[PDB]
Scaffold this active site. Structure first.
Site, PDB file in Angstrom:
ATOM      1  N   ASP A   1       4.640   7.259 -10.500  1.00 15.33           N
ATOM      2  CA  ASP A   1       4.046   7.903  -9.206  1.00 15.33           C
ATOM      3  C   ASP A   1       3.587   9.370  -9.647  1.00 15.33           C
ATOM      4  OD1 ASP A   1       4.316   5.914  -7.682  1.00 15.33           O
ATOM      5  OD2 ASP A   1       6.303   6.094  -7.214  1.00 15.33           O
TER       6      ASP A   1
ATOM      7  N   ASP B   1       2.529  -0.397  -6.138  1.00 17.07           N
ATOM      8  CA  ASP B   1       1.853   1.029  -6.102  1.00 17.07           C
ATOM      9  C   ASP B   1       1.050   1.779  -7.238  1.00 17.07           C
ATOM     10  OD1 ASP B   1       4.605   1.185  -6.908  1.00 17.07           O
ATOM     11  OD2 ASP B   1       4.563   3.197  -6.479  1.00 17.07           O
TER      12      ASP B   1
END
EC number: 3.2.1.179
Length: 377
Positions: A88, A149
């Protein structure tokens, strides 16, 4: 209109900055207050993004200065390498450092974003042909696991490639995006949350989740990451197949939107008021729908349908979930959910939901597209 909706966000953000200080919001936990951290999670960049969006809308330096302070915090986070052994990095640095470069061309911010892209590249596993989502390299359980994601973290890499001219960035991002399309997206246009590959050779092992109702269910935030993520990658790569996938996933999502216009946490659980919602999935999707529309020719009749679907989604969020600036509320939209299965903040504010809600408003009102790519690229 959108100005008053943005107005509430502006007020909430200005007040939040003075309360949070140098802290970062994550999610609420049973109240209208955000649980805060010292820039140690995967969501810190969303706060930076909100500050930059507020600055772009108003030109008010209180927002810019707050954003710049968060960038200084991220510079320190990288130098200390605090909790950055995951994928991330894009969420964290595209919305903070890269954002400052996009907004005012700050060279030091650009360097930080590039240094961050470098760190994200360290997650690539040549033997498996994927970017490892979490855990140290060789992790017995997560060593070869990818999560959907990651698609929104590839923009940091793609942007870095276009800034440096190093073809390796695009090569890695393209490979991961294509592998995600083949294994994370299902035949009925739904999607898995995560997928496991053999660390030694990259062979596909299985799809699964720790957040979705079941390994074969459809966790709505996951579906949303797919919609926006594949569209962002199709723009950078000029890949029509990835765009087609984003559209397929978008239609699948839209067909399952409940009466009030905001989705439940998973499509494969009872779709009734008794089930938790995830306003963040709807916010992410609203942005994804607009991104998709921006890549379609105006002669395509579905382009306006995607735009209108986005406007309908934002309207549903504003009317049934948006918080007015009452001097106390710290979030933009209610009823987001972090980890329903774990009983972790299942009916709360989520900073990512807030960021995407505001990005959607800025896209609709000012044509401001966020910080995933250079303006008018």
């Amino acid at each position: 209109m959108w100005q008053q909706a943005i107005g509430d966000a502006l007020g909430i953000t200005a007040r939040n900055l003075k309360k949070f200080g140098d802290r970062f919001p994550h999610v609420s936990d049973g109240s209208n207050k955000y649980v805060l951290n010292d820039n140690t999670d995967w969501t810190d960049g969303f706060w930076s993004g909100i500050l930059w969006l507020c600055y772009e809308y108003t030109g008010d330096e209180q927002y810019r200065e707050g954003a710049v302070r968060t960038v200084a915090s991220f510079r320190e986070r990288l130098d200390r390498f605090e909790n950055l052994d995951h994928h991330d990095i894009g969420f964290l640095y595209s919305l903070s450092a890269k954002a400052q470069w996009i907004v005012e061309k700050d060279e030091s911010a650009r360097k930080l974003a590039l240094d961050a892209a470098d760190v994200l590249m360290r997650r690539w596993r040549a033997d498996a042909g994927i970017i490892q989502a979490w855990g140290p390299k060789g992790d017995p359980e997560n060593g070869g696991r990818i999560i959907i994601d990651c698609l929104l973290n590839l923009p940091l890499l793609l942007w870095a490639g276009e800034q440096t001219g190093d073809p390796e960035y695009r090569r890695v991002a393209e490979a991961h995006a294509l592998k995600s399309r083949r294994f994370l997206v299902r035949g009925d246009d739904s999607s898995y949350h995560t997928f496991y590959f053999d660390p030694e050779n990259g062979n596909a092992i299985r799809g699964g989740t720790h957040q979705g109702n079941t390994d074969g269910s459809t966790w709505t935030r996951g579906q949303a990451w797919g919609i926006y993520g594949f569209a962002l990658n199709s723009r950078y790569l000029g890949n029509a197949d990835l765009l087609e996938t984003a559209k397929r996933m978008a239609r699948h999502f839209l067909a399952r939107v409940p009466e009030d216009g905001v989705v439940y946490w998973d499509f494969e659980v009872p779709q009734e008021p008794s089930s938790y919602r995830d306003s963040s999935a709807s916010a992410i999707t609203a942005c994804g729908l607009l991104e998709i529309a921006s890549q379609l020719d105006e002669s395509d009749p579905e382009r306006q349908r995607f735009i209108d679907a986005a406007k309908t989604t934002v309207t549903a969020l504003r009317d049934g979930y948006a918080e007015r600036d009452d001097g106390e509320a710290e979030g933009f939209i209610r009823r987001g959910s972090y980890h329903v299965r774990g009983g972790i903040s299942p009916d709360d504010y989520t900073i990512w939901g807030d960021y995407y809600y505001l990005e959607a408003l800025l896209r609709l009102e000012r044509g401001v597209t966020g910080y995933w790519y250079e303006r008018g690229r």
